[PDB]
């Protein structure tokens, strides 16, 4: 009952307008959005464990000093509400539209905004991160391949399965890399910009759910998926990461199948359909 949660918040934080306040819901978490603050309320007592999990990931990422904002716990985890709640900062800024990011007058600025963040992520103390974050597992793509063949291959054309087998294989073939912080989903929607004296500034990165000690190529793949090779070539040039192109393409070739598999597993029909379109005719 969002009524109770509303009272929980007003009681704990009297001065926080919940009229015209966002709400995300799922069988796991309720989230009230406000001007400067996000309130997360777990639904089960097991899902309560997500709260210190989120605090631990965000604190470890903050400690790397990326030079851009990440969500900040604004409160201790509290055992108020049904199964606890956590107050996080709300970051300001908007994703860069593909059109905006690529203009000749801003493309170099955008490339360096991505580069300075990715550079800081690659320079993270991995021994510290490895204690808190998930660590890329050598069996990850093997296992992912298994679940795609079991769950999605039946829904595909023969041409679909051939294409999917090549894309799965390129990922399974990659040698294991765990050398820095990886966001794991660094598409445009999770990267927030403001016009600062009439040029873009990357001010925030949100949604660290897939954060891990892993392969820097995975974040470059995601930037490529959102903004195209013109931008990623400039980021790679700046980083001196020309070595990574095969790995970047291997990650990018799994993105439609990742979305399809999640659509099947999450029971989202539109994600399943959208993910599979290149892998069948009808």
């Amino acid at each position: 009952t969002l009524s109770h949660l509303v009272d929980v918040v007003r009681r704990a934080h009297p001065d926080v307008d919940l009229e015209g306040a966002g709400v995300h819901s799922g069988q796991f978490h309720d989230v009230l959005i406000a001007r400067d603050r996000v309130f997360r309320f777990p639904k089960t007592a097991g899902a309560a464990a997500e709260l210190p999990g989120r605090v631990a990931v965000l604190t470890a990422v903050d400690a790397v000093e990326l030079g851009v904002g990440v969500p900040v716990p604004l409160s201790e985890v509290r055992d108020g509400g049904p199964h606890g709640f956590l107050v996080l900062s709300r970051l300001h800024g908007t994703p860069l539209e593909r059109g905006d990011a690529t203009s000749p007058e801003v493309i170099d600025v955008v490339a360096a905004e991505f580069a300075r963040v990715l550079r800081a992520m690659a320079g993270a103390d991995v021994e510290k991160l490895r204690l808190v974050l998930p660590v890329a597992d050598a069996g990850r793509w093997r296992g992912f391949a298994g679940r795609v063949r079991a769950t999605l291959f039946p829904l595909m054309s023969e041409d679909g399965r051939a294409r999917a087998e090549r894309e799965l294989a390129a990922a399974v073939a990659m040698d294991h890399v765990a050398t820095g912080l990886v966001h794991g989903d660094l598409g445009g929607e999770n990267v927030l910009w403001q016009q600062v004296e009439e040029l873009p500034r990357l001010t925030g990165i949100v949604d660290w759910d897939e954060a891990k000690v892993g392969d820097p190529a995975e974040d470059l793949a995601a930037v490529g998926a959102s903004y195209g090779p013109e931008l990623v070539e400039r980021v790679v040039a700046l980083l001196g990461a020309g070595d990574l192109w095969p790995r970047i393409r291997a990650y990018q070739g799994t993105f439609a199948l990742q979305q399809a598999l999640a659509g099947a597993e999450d029971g989202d029909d539109e994600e399943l359909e959208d993910g599979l379109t290149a892998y069948r005719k009808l």
Binding site: D185, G187, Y251, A256, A262, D268, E271, G275
Partner: peptide
């Protein structure tokens, strides 16, 4: 979700 990975 969504093509980037979600």
């Amino acid at each position: 979700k969504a093509x980037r990975a979600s």
